[PDB]
Amino acid sequence: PPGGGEQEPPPPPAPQDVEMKEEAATGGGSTGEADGKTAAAAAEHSQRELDTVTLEDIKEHVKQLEKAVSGKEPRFVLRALRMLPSTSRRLNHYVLYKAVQGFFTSNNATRDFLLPFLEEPMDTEADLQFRPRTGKAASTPLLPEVEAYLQLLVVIFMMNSKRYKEAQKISDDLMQKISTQNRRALDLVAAKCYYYHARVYEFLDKLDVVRSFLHARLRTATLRHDADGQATLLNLLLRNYLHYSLYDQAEKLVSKSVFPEQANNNEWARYLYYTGRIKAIQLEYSEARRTMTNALRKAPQHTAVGFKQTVHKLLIVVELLLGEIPDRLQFRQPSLKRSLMPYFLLTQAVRTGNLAKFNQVLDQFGEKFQADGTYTLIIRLRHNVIKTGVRMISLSYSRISLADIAQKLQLDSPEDAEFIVAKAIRDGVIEASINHEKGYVQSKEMIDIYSTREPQLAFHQRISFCLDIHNMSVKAMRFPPKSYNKDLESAEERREREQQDLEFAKEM
Amino acid sequence: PKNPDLRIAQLRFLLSLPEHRGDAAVRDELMAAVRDNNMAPYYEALCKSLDWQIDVDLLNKMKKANEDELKRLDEELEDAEKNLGESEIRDAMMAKAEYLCRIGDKEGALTAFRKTYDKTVALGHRLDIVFYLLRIGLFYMDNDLITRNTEKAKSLIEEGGDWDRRNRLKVYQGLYCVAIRDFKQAAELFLDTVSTFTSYELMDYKTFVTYTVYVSMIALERPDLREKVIKGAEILEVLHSLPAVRQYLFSLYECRYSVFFQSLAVVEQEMKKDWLFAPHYRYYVREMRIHAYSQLLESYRSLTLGYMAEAFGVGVEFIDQELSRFIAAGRLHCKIDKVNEIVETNRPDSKNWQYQETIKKGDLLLNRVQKLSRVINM
Amino acid sequence: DKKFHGILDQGEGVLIIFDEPPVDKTYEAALETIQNMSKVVDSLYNKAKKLT
């Protein structure tokens, strides 16, 4: 008794007290303001609800035995909100239930009472007018069964609850699709519900039916409106296709909503990562660099761990495919050094023109590269090693025998050396010529690049950039000023005094 | 007081990075710790170094000595409030700050120093506080502390001449500059051989002369190496007692490239294990070698690589590989032909080199300014 | 010793003499101005980020 008579009940009351101002007070504030008069895009409760969900991810971790936090769902389900005195009475009844839980034991909904949470929306004299509130309460109740899924084959209950929530969402899409107030307040809620359903399906289900449902929902959208709903669904569909090995490029290249121009810097990173991955896997490297750099630079700055790992790894791999990447880890993190050491060896072998080191590292870390899902994009790189070796040996020498070329590239055959050199010459890699009868290669030397036109272009690009940035800055200039109607010149009644003084001076 | 403490740091390093060097310094460092009733070094030294399982008695007795001294100083404070001079409590806590800094850890010393900085109305005492802060920063390698204290000291020394304090600050600033990879300013600031080296705290004069010649070989060129480091009377008088360094300088200057390599190898061995040169001891070497290569080819036009074999160091293949790997880097502008083993020279214009630097600085500044631009406005 | 810039040829013992243009003084000022601008941009962080 002494062990839990002061610390265990406190854990129940402290989490309950926190949930009093976390969901009950926050729910009341949203009902009176966000769900009351009106709620704009920057709703004080929508961001608050998102932050509350993110915090609740690390606020409650146990199954909430003895209704420490599980009875909060029973407490939030015992709400009427039908009339102002009726809402006060419902709040008082919830307070009485909390007092009883302080005195007696409430329902211990810890892996044993999740089923009885289905008729609650139809009970306790609930008010169904606030459809977004019901959707949010269902997503939060789904999260309580989806916070950790309780493992041990308990994802079936979460899937059933998600199916019920999806049926409710389909009803909301059916009930006033014009959204008098159906979607205008639940669009973010609908996106979050779709994301949670996709997460549950990826956890313990199949995504084929989820993909069909998402495609149908997206088709239903993009006709009434084309904002805030055409991005998360598209990202989920792209992720579902990325799980398999489909084309994944026909759908992305026909949709005009990939650039909604309003993503809150959230879906843009995922869209850019998917587009860059597809472009790199589609034998195109020039275009994907800008997109993936934008993706990396649009990522959240604080505590995004797993995400910038894979994207930065792919960025350095594809930049090696292009052939220049010195700086990659100048922002070392405690979970960043371990996951990037093997690729270091790769680039260290890649930078030199030798190819034996390429095999020496590949035959060692092939399994690790396969486990990271980049083996198919890492075996097509030996040509770049040969190219950089030829370029280096052309820069260094001017008149060199082909046998030495073969020896210093260890191509194992001098006959293929002339073919490789010719192929390099043909695409404009080098400007040298070889004499078959003699054998040596006579490099062509021509230097005077300042007289060439190209510096002009190399400056034009940056000049245009610097001219654009200023304009953007001045375009974001006068947004914060507002309500400056105050316009007073000198005074109100001083004109009469001045006129009187002038008349007095004139009279004298 | 931090007048004798600097050497301790070196010994610490001599046990950390050198893998096999763990037998000599382990006894005299522990002797310096058992003296002065130290407690600061071995909160973590015992963890990093040997376990020293038989230690509890020394720990307890040193702790008890620490509380004895602290209690005596506090009772002096208490006696001092009732009849104060220049608020004699504040001079008393200034006296306690040295002991707390020497025996205790950083935070207590910093708090005591920041508390006692508000007493002194004389400028010299404030300068002494700043010098203690700078010495602590050098001891524990705190970049922000060093920068802030250096700028504060430079601002404060403007009032009143105090040319001695200026020379001391110049020596401190030179040590900080040579700590990072900045040799130009280090060799510039090390022109105090004749303007006094009274800062015997950090090191002795002979080490100062060796450091200044080592950095003068990097920073400056022949028309100044012939005017300041080879003509100085005092530096030559000191160097006369050091045959190795004099040989190492004359070999480079008199164009005896054969004997240059032995001195270069010995010097780099010496500075690999040396403090504040180890983390980049390689880079220094990678200059001198290539520097010598650039000091021979600029007179002739078609020198063969055969001559370099007996004139610069044996091994034609070694010279070939070094020349190739330095050509590929973009510096040491020349060319080599291997079918007949002939080295040719060229003279690129000083406008190409003065253009990629502009473009790369512009790129870096553009990246930084774009990051700054989109940090704000969410 | 840089008091006379030319080149020497050992094959025929021939002293080739050539002149070079003076170094352009426009660039280095721009380089150090760019460095000063970098310092200013660095200083703007403490004014901007400390409340955002």
């Binding site: 400056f459 940056r462 000049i463 610097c466 001219l467 940035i469 200023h470 800055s473 001045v474 974001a476 200039m477 914060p480 000023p481 | 512009g362 500044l365 553009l366 300014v369 700054l372 631009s373 704000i376 406005n377 | 721009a30 101005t33 760019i34 601008m37 200013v40 941009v41 703007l44 004014k47 901007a48 409340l51």
Partner: peptide, 30 residues
């Protein structure tokens, strides 16, 4: 090129100044 860079820096400084000076005006109304 250099002049454009300077103009961009000045524009960023002006934006920072305006935003900082104006964000501290809503709370004075209570």
């Amino acid at each position: 090129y250099l002049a454009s860079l300077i103009r961009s820096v000045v524009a960023l400084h002006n934006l920072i100044n305006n935003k900082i000076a104006n964000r501290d005006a809503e709370k004075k109304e209570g």
